[PDB]
């Protein structure tokens, strides 16, 4: 029984990239023109892309020209679809369909389909950081800072007292959490004698979301 199976669907942020694959069972793709088709939320089908035998011709839906690429691997019988600069209206179930019939001709219908893989583009391409104080609470030195959490994507810039405080500052490489959002910390060591007299404010700039936050870090 001829079968096709898509792989790679998932959640993508607007603007992101995702690559789908399609594999087969009980026939070889070499003699078949291969196609990608999607079912949009409204329920209708939309032709997305076609790649002929030998990859001689590649054709695309007007809505996706320039953003998608279709490829074939006849030797291991796989088809690929690259999707870049994704838009919310790309959200759909993607099926990989074979052009074929009992006996092949120059123009056959789609006689075998995969079950479909779900591709979901969230509308938000960006999310602004949360900023939390790391309040001071050993010896002549005190450490304080800001925790910049749950933003996307990289990078963010951090300045202290609008740039006046540079000595002793460490802003760590961001790390990617299991949630898919980044977080990092920026800290500075200062004289213990300065708490209560000197004000310290971290200035966080997330240019990708055009977000700015000023956070006063005080004892306790």
């Amino acid at each position: 029984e001829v079968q096709l199976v898509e792989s790679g669907g998932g959640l993508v942020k607007a603007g992101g990239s995702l690559i789908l694959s399609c594999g087969v069972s009980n026939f070889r793709i070499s003699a078949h023109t291969m196609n990608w088709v999607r079912r949009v939320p409204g329920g209708g089908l939309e032709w997305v892309a076609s790649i002929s035998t030998s990859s001689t011709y590649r054709d695309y839906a007007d809505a996706v020209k320039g953003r998608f690429t279709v490829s074939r691997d006849d030797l291991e019988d796989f088809v690929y679809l690259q999707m870049h600069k994704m838009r919310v209206e790309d959200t759909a179930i993607y099926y990989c369909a074979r052009k074929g019939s009992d006996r092949l001709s120059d123009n056959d219908p789609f006689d075998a389909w995969g079950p479909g893989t779900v591709v979901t583009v969230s509308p938000a391409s960006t999310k602004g950081p949360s900023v939390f104080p790391l309040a001071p609470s050993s010896g002549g030195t005190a450490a304080l800072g800001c925790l910049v959490k749950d933003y996307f994507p990289e990078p963010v810039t951090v300045s202290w007292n609008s740039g006046a405080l540079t000595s002793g500052v460490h802003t760590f490489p961001a790390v990617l959490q299991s949630s898919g959002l980044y977080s990092l910390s920026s800290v500075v060591t200062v004289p213990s004698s300065s708490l209560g007299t000197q004000t310290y404010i971290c200035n966080v700039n997330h240019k990708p979301s055009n977000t700015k936050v000023d956070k006063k870090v005080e004892p306790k």
Binding site: G44, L45, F110, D111, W113, G114, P115
Partner: protein, 213 residues
């Protein structure tokens, strides 16, 4: 550059009926037209190609006709396996275009939904998230609209919905909408409402609740 216009968009019928789906092409496509069936969440199934040729295995109750710009799919003797969405398709050597699709459903009398709203449980609130749910129970036909209002401010992008398939016993549908907010936003506002518009109601029904009671 060929626009495929399918008609009607929804076809309500009963078991045993003979029904006709029309497909129109913006320009002549000879007989290069195929018909597919698809059931919810399943892969499409090829039924007819070359306008009137049934593929092997397609029951004889299905037939196709037409040429040029006008094509017809006929189903003589609707069964229960036949309720599904049907898609027409112009196929060319190296591209294709599909119609919008026609959903074939079971005919019944209009029925207004029963509407219910559920606030977030305190347990959920304690963990940082607030889902408010609206239930539309046993209504017909499926097209209905739900709008969330928070303190009478319309919501967007923070709601999801799901619809059941047509019920096996009374041919009705049900729908669930989940509005999701952070603890902060939920606790900033007092009046949560959801408004349902549907062919079975004399006007939109709104129900609401006030936070805390």
């Amino acid at each position: 550059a060929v626009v495929m216009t399918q008609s009607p968009s929804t076809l309500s019928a009963s078991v045993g009926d003979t029904i006709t789906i029309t497909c129109r092409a913006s320009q002549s496509i000879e007989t290069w037209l195929a018909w597919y069936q698809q059931k919810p969440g399943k892969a499409p199934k090829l039924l007819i190609y070359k306008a009137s040729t049934l593929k092997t295995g397609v029951p004889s109750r299905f037939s196709g006709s037409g040429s040029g710009t006008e094509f017809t799919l006929t189903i003589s003797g609707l069964q229960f396996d036949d309720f599904a969405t049907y898609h027409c398709q112009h196929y060319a050597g190296y591209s294709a275009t599909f119609g919008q699709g026609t959903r074939v459903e079971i005919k019944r009398t209009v029925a207004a939904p029963s509407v219910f709203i559920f606030p977030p449980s305190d347990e959920q609130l304690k963990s940082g998230t607030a889902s408010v749910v609206c239930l539309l129970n046993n209504f017909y036909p499926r097209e209905a609209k739900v709008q969330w209002k928070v303190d009478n401010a319309l919501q967007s992008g923070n709601s999801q919905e799901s619809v059941t398939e047509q019920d096996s016993k009374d041919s009705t549908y049900s729908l669930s909408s989940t509005l999701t907010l952070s603890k902060a936003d939920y606790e900033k506002h007092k009046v949560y409402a959801c408004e349902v518009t549907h062919q079975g109601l004399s006007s939109p029904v709104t129900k609401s609740f006030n936070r805390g009671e």
